[PDB]
Amino acid sequence: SNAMDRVATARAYYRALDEHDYDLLSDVLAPDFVHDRPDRTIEGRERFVRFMREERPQTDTSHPIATIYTGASTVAVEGRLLNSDGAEITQFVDVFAFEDGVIGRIRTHTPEP
Amino acid sequence: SNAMDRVATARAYYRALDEHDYDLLSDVLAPDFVHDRPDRTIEGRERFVRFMREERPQTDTSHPIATIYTGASTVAVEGRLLNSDGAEITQFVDVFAFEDGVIGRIRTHTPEP
Ligand SMILES: [Mg+2]
Ligand SMILES: [Mg+2]
Ligand code: NA
Numbered sequence: 001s002n003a004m005d006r007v008a009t010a011r012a013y014y015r016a017l018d019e020h021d022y023d024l025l026s027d028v029l030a031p032d033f034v035h036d037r038p039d040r041t042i043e044g045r046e047r048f049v050r051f052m053r054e055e056r057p058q059t060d061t062s063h064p065i066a067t068i069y070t071g072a073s074t075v076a077v078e079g080r081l082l083n084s085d086g087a088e089i090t091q092f093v094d095v096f097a098f099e100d101g102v103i104g105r106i107r108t109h110t111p112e113p
Numbered sequence: 114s115n116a117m118d119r120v121a122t123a124r125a126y127y128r129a130l131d132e133h134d135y136d137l138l139s140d141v142l143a144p145d146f147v148h149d150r151p152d153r154t155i156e157g158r159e160r161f162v163r164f165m166r167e168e169r170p171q172t173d174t175s176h177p178i179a180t181i182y183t184g185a186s187t188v189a190v191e192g193r194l195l196n197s198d199g200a201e202i203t204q205f206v207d208v209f210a211f212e213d214g215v216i217g218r219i220r221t222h223t224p225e226p
Contacts, residue, residue, distance in 0.1 A: 003151070007225055036185035038116070054206045069222030072149045076189060076206040076222040093182045093189040095208050095220075107208075109189040111183030112120060 001098070003070045009103060010096050014063040022053050030104045037108035044087045060084040072100065118180055122216060123188045123209045127176040135162050143217045150221035171195040186211065 009028050016025035026049055033045040042048045065079040075096040081089040090110050099107040120140050121163045129138035139162050148155045155161050168171075182189040186210040194202040203223050210218040 003225075016199065025141070036187075038183060038185055043183055067204075068225045069204075070225050071208070071222040072221050073218045074152065074222070076208060078191065083192075089123050092212065093191065093206060095184075095189060107187050107189075109180065109182045109184040109187070112181045112183050 001073075001101070004015065005073075005101070006073075006075050006098055007068055009098070009101070010077055010094075011065075013096075013103060013106075014077075014079075015018065017052060018062045020053075022049050025049055026054065028103055030099050030102045033103060034105045035108070036106070038110060050059065058083055058089060061089065075107065116183060119186075119209070119211050120183060123181065123190055123207075123210070124178070126209075126216065126219075127178065127190075127192075130165060131175050133166070133172065135166050138162055138165065141216055143212055143215045146216060147218045148221070149218065150223070171196060171202075174202065190222050 012024060012028050013052050016022065016028065026045060029045045029048065031045050033048055035042045035048055061084065062082045064082060065077055067078045069076040069078070075097070078093055080091050083089055083096045093109045095109070096103055097106040125137060125141050129130050129135070129141065139158060141156045142161065144158050145156070146158045146161055148161055148164065155164050174197065176192050178190055178192040180191045182191070190206070190207045190209070196202055206222045208220040208222065209216055
């Protein structure tokens with residue numbers, strides 16, 4: 001439990017998604033991991049890994065990161081989601097909560113605008 | 114909608130701090146409200162309002178908002194803290210957790226090294 005490790009784990013999460021390394025993805029998530037965004041909540045690590053492996057509406061995407069912000073126990077990542085042609089799907093701020101060195105929850109926020 | 118209500122409440126928080134409207138500030142917080150950042154946690158609504166009124170190193174600051182990002186149940190506000198002369202103290206992302214019609218927790222995040 002330190003700030004630098006939390007940031008490194010957040011960076012590893014995006015690397016897992018973008019490299020389609022779902023072994024790495026599982027390795028950085030708690031069993032009871034929950035992902036939230038306005039239009040979708042995905043509950044549980046195995047459901048989440050399956051969704052990212054098999055069910056994302058856009059394939060071969062990336063998450064360029066603009067700025068990472070550190071809090072007392074959480075990390076907020078400001079970035080964008082790009083499709084395979086570099087086109088912006090959305091901007092986001094993802095807020096990571098941690099338990100035991102792994103990610104317990106990610107709350108995705110999109111511009112109001 | 115509840116989502117619109119949460120965004121309005123987050124905006125009202127900054128309006129209150131900046132106008133020193135501590136009556137309004139009280140009105141938007143949970144009784145057991147917690148404000149978080151690295152090396153400072155402030156607990157309790159009356160105690161927090163009293164901190165903002167009396168104990169801040171600078172009370173004549175402003176919090177111009179750049180972008181509000183909305184999540185499933187939380188709001189992430191990207192802004193800057195300016196001193197009375199308009200100079201930047203820090204960039205921040207504040208993450209608002211809501212409960213029972215009011216703000217339960219704000220987690221302040223500042224840019225990583
Ligand atoms: Mg006084
Ligand atoms: Mg002023
Ligand atoms: Na920080």
